[PDB]
Amino acid sequence: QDAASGEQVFKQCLVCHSIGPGAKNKVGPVLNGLFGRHSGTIEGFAYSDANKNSGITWTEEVFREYIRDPKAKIPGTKMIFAGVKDEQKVSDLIAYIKQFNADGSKK
Ligand code: HEC
Numbered sequence: 001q002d003a004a005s006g007e008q009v010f011k012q013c014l015v016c017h018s019i020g021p022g023a024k025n026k027v028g029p030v031l032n033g034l035f036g037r038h039s040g041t042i043e044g045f046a047y048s049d050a051n052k053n054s055g056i057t058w059t060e061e062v063f064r065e066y067i068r069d070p071k072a073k074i075p076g077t078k079m080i081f082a083g084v085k086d087e088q089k090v091s092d093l094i095a096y097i098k099q100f101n102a103d104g105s106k107k
Pocket of ligand 1: 009028029034038039046047049052058
């Protein structure tokens, strides 16, 4: 779906997470270069065992399921959020993010 739209839905994400350039960790790990990266991999982030010992590897398909309801895919994770149980939204989320990658740029 669409990114311009998806930027809106990340608003409820930015509260704890960063993206783009000069993105530094916060209550949660920066979401730069998310797709492909290994779960609990970004450094300077005190991941939970649950997150980092999962072996997830964040592909669009598992994020799609995660975001829907976190506690169910990484049961016991530190991310206390009742997901994006909203299908239009999730798709645009996965458009905006995918757009940054690694150091916050376009690809
Ligand atoms: C504050 C309450 C948060 C909101 C709102 C969102 N996220 Fe989050 N996220 C938060 C924490 C504390 C953590 C760490 C979990 C742990 O157990 O260590 C996370 C983690 C993620 C991850 C995992 C990343 C990795 O490198 O493994 C992802 C993919 C993620 N968060 C995505 C995400 C998105 C897209 C959100 C908007 C809908 C979102 N989170 C909300 C804190 C918070």
